[PDB]
């Protein structure tokens, strides 16, 4: 997202406003305002790693924009919007993740490698790989009998079609010491 | 659901794996290790587009 | 299937490590364990 000092009314604020969001969601209900629409309007830009060196990014827009002029204990410890230099803002931080990690529920609550492991196992999980399975002659294929969408999901899964083509079942699980088996 | 991006070659679905490389036509200065006559080098991996 | 169509190979100073520059471009967790660890990136 592009952030501009360019706002007569106050501070340095993100080019994209609540009006563009409704303009996009008008098209989302139609299934005339694309991604290209934001790109050509100049609200969003493409930044490679070399360009990234000369910019300054906000993680959240709202949380990292208007400064101070009680706080919940259960939430994580966050920093601030100290800078008035912000050239850009992060669409969503969860986008640093790739296909596999994006199925991990609460990955910000796991030890670093435990996540590296799930982004290896999900590739060996059974489910519905494609709906045409019955019509294709592939050497080896596994289809889960009664697949289930996960109860706990990532906002990212929406675009990954995971709830449409799952890899597992929601098992009723006890974490217990039972027969020692 | 099938996204494409792959090829069908003699029946099989083949994926072309992205192959990482260092960028061309780029000026890079590297300190050359203690047992060497040359102390520093400036390299350019020049090739035509 | 999706993650196989987003795969990267790095053939041959410290490549395997997760670099600062990989932020937003490459997955910090999707990497094999073993000889390929950190050399096979995922977008």
């Amino acid at each position: 997202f592009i952030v501009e000092d360019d706002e007569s009314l106050g501070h340095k604020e993100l080019k994209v406003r609540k009006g563009h969001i409704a303009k996009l969601m008008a098209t989302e209900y139609q299934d005339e305002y694309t991604w290209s629409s934001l790109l050509n309007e100049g609200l969003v830009e493409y930044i490679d790693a070399e360009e990234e060196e000369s910019i300054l990014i906000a993680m959240q827009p709202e949380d990292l924009e208007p400064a101070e002029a009680d706080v919940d204990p259960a939430k994580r410890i966050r920093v601030s919007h100290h800078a008035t230099t912000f050239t850009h803002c992060e669409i969503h931080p969860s986008m640093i993740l790739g296909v596999a990690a994006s199925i991990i529920p609460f990955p910000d609550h796991n030890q670093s490698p435990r996540n590296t492991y799930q982004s290896a196992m999900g590739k060996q999980a059974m489910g519905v790989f494609l709906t045409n399975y019955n019509v294709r002659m592939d050497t080896m294929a596994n289809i889960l009998y009664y697949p289930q969408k996960p109860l706990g999901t990532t906002r990212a899964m929406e675009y990954l079609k995971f709830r449409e083509l799952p890899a597992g079942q929601n098992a009723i699980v006890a974490i217990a010491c039972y027969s020692g088996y | 659901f099938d996204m494409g991006g792959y090829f069908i070659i003699n029946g099989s679905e083949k994926v072309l794996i992205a192959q990482e490389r260092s960028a061309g036509n780029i000026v890079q200065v590297f300190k050359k290790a203690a047992p060497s006559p040359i102390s520093h080098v400036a390299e350019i991996r020049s090739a035509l587009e | 299937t999706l993650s196989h169509l987003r795969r990267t190979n790095t053939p041959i100073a410290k490549p395997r490590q997760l670099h600062n520059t990989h932020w937003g471009l490459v997955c910090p967790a999707e990497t094999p364990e073993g000889q390929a660890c950190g050399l096979v990136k995922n977008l």
């Binding site: 997202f1 604020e13 993100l14 994209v16 406003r17 609540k18 009006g19 969001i21 409704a22 996009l24 969601m25 098209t27 989302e28 305002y33 694309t34 991604w35 290209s36 934001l38 969003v44 959240q60 827009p61 709202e62 949380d63 924009e65 669409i91 969503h92 986008m95 296909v99 906002r155 929406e158 675009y159 990954l160 | 996204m3 494409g4 991006g5 792959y6 072309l16 992205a18 | 999706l2 169509l5 987003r6 977008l43």
Partner: peptide, 30 residues
């Protein structure tokens, strides 16, 4: 107020539009 600041949930409506247009193998195809 068609030019009001954006919220946290709003970024998803943009991400929706990105994949709506680009898909997931955007790179391979293009």
């Amino acid at each position: 107020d068609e030019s009001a600041p954006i919220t946290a949930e709003d970024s998803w409506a943009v991400i929706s539009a990105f994949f709506r247009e680009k898909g997931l193998v955007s790179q391979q195809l293009d």
